[PDB]
Design a protein around this motif. Structure first.
Motif, mmCIF file in Angstrom:
data_model
loop_
_atom_site.group_PDB
_atom_site.id
_atom_site.type_symbol
_atom_site.label_atom_id
_atom_site.label_comp_id
_atom_site.label_asym_id
_atom_site.label_seq_id
_atom_site.Cartn_x
_atom_site.Cartn_y
_atom_site.Cartn_z
ATOM 1 N N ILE A 179 41.096 13.058 44.891
ATOM 2 C CA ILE A 179 42.484 13.131 45.309
ATOM 3 C C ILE A 179 42.811 14.484 45.924
ATOM 4 N N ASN A 180 42.374 15.568 45.295
ATOM 5 C CA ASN A 180 42.854 16.901 45.628
ATOM 6 C C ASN A 180 41.924 17.698 46.528
ATOM 7 N N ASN A 181 40.778 17.152 46.915
ATOM 8 C CA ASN A 181 39.873 17.916 47.758
ATOM 9 C C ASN A 181 40.409 18.001 49.182
ATOM 10 N N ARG A 182 40.110 19.115 49.843
ATOM 11 C CA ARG A 182 40.574 19.351 51.203
ATOM 12 C C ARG A 182 39.641 18.789 52.260
ATOM 13 N N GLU A 183 38.503 18.230 51.867
ATOM 14 C CA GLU A 183 37.551 17.678 52.818
ATOM 15 C C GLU A 183 37.615 16.159 52.870
ATOM 16 N N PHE A 184 37.472 15.494 51.724
ATOM 17 C CA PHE A 184 37.552 14.041 51.666
ATOM 18 C C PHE A 184 38.631 13.532 50.716
ATOM 19 N N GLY A 185 39.526 14.394 50.242
ATOM 20 C CA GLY A 185 40.562 13.944 49.335
ATOM 21 C C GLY A 185 41.529 12.987 50.008
ATOM 22 N N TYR A 203 26.571 12.569 42.689
ATOM 23 C CA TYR A 203 26.853 12.618 44.119
ATOM 24 C C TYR A 203 27.925 11.599 44.479
ATOM 25 N N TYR A 204 28.955 12.044 45.195
ATOM 26 C CA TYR A 204 30.106 11.192 45.458
ATOM 27 C C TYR A 204 30.846 11.679 46.697
ATOM 28 N N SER A 205 31.544 10.757 47.352
ATOM 29 C CA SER A 205 32.435 11.100 48.454
ATOM 30 C C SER A 205 33.435 9.961 48.627
ATOM 31 N N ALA A 206 34.357 10.135 49.573
ATOM 32 C CA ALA A 206 35.375 9.140 49.876
ATOM 33 C C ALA A 206 35.509 9.006 51.386
ATOM 34 N N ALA A 207 35.908 7.819 51.836
ATOM 35 C CA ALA A 207 36.080 7.557 53.260
ATOM 36 C C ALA A 207 37.195 6.550 53.495
ATOM 37 N N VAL A 208 38.101 6.879 54.409
ATOM 38 C CA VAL A 208 39.150 5.967 54.854
ATOM 39 C C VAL A 208 38.707 5.437 56.211
ATOM 40 N N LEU A 209 38.375 4.146 56.263
ATOM 41 C CA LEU A 209 37.774 3.575 57.465
ATOM 42 C C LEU A 209 38.738 3.562 58.646
#
Length: 266
Positions: free
Chosen positions: A99-105, A245-251
């Motif tokens: 939620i709070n990350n500036r790269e993938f939040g 290892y984890y990340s997020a993506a909004v398609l």
């Protein structure tokens, strides 16, 4: 009476329990976000140059004394319990970073057209309807702080509205027009007593917000999480490296909407 009872306890065993963590919360984002497998820690999104997503690592060093690992294993394995608590802390900070990350939040990867403010400041049903209309194609769920949820419920009560509570799996949750609302304390509440509400569409096939991980890694403990022995030092402390290892993506930009400047109230 008391002395005799104490003396008898001296020859009896007490029932103890796993260490209890107050911090542990309901990590709703991890449970609700679908996870898509990536290869090489890279994920390409063809957007209308393609965006490149690199897996972030939440890692820490677990230090356990050699004496603890050797002796204190009779009722329960203390090194295993320490590993479980370490993994729980890792998952909590993972939820915070989603939620709070500036790269993938999510709070920082929302399109400027998708971020909308409140007309008056309290989260009125009109603002909820505007947020719903922003993501109007298969809206998955709403995410809000407990203070935010209390504020929306006080607006409902003031307007004479009793929304139906949806039964999601074995859990009953508040909802707005069929969209379940999930509490999450990781969403910041500013010093001006303001917060934000997130509406998400989830899924790779629906062009929604997805979670990125890599299962199958070697030395794996839990999915996409690995534990590796690092060595013992001069003070006889066993060191383990635990990495997730984890990340997020909004398609697509319309899969995420944010209602901003929500006055939760003191």
């Amino acid at each position: 009476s008391s002395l005799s009872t104490a003396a008898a306890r001296n020859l009896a065993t007490t029932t103890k329990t796993v260490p209890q963590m107050q911090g542990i919360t309901s990590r709703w984002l991890l449970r609700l976000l679908p996870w898509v497998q990536v290869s090489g820690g890279t994920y390409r999104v063809n957007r209308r140059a393609p965006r490149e997503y690199e897996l972030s690592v939440a890692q820490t060093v677990l230090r356990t004394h050699t004496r603890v690992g050797d002796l204190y294993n009779d009722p329960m394995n203390q090194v295993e319990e320490q590993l479980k608590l370490t993994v729980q802390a890792l998952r909590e900070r993972q939820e915070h970073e989603m939620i709070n990350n500036r790269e993938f939040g999510l709070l920082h990867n929302a399109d400027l057209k998708q971020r909308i403010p409140t007309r008056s400041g309290p989260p009125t049903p009109d603002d909820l309807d505007d947020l719903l209309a922003t993501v109007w194609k298969d809206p998955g769920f709403l995410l809000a702080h407990p203070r935010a949820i209390a504020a929306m419920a006080r607006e409902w009560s003031a307007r004479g509205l009793y929304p139906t509570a949806v039964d999601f799996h074995g859990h009953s949750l508040p909802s707005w027009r069929g969209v379940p609302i999930f509490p999450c304390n990781k969403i910041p509440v500013t010093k001006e007593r303001t917060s934000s509400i997130l509406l998400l569409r989830t899924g790779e096939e629906k062009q929604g917000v997805v979670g990125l991980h890599q299962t199958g890694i070697p030395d794996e403990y839990e999915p996409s999480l690995s534990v590796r022995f690092m060595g013992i030092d001069d003070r006889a402390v066993i060191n383990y490296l635990v990495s997730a290892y984890y990340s997020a993506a909004v398609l697509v930009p319309d899969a995420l909407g944010v209602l901003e400047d929500v006055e939760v109230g003191l």
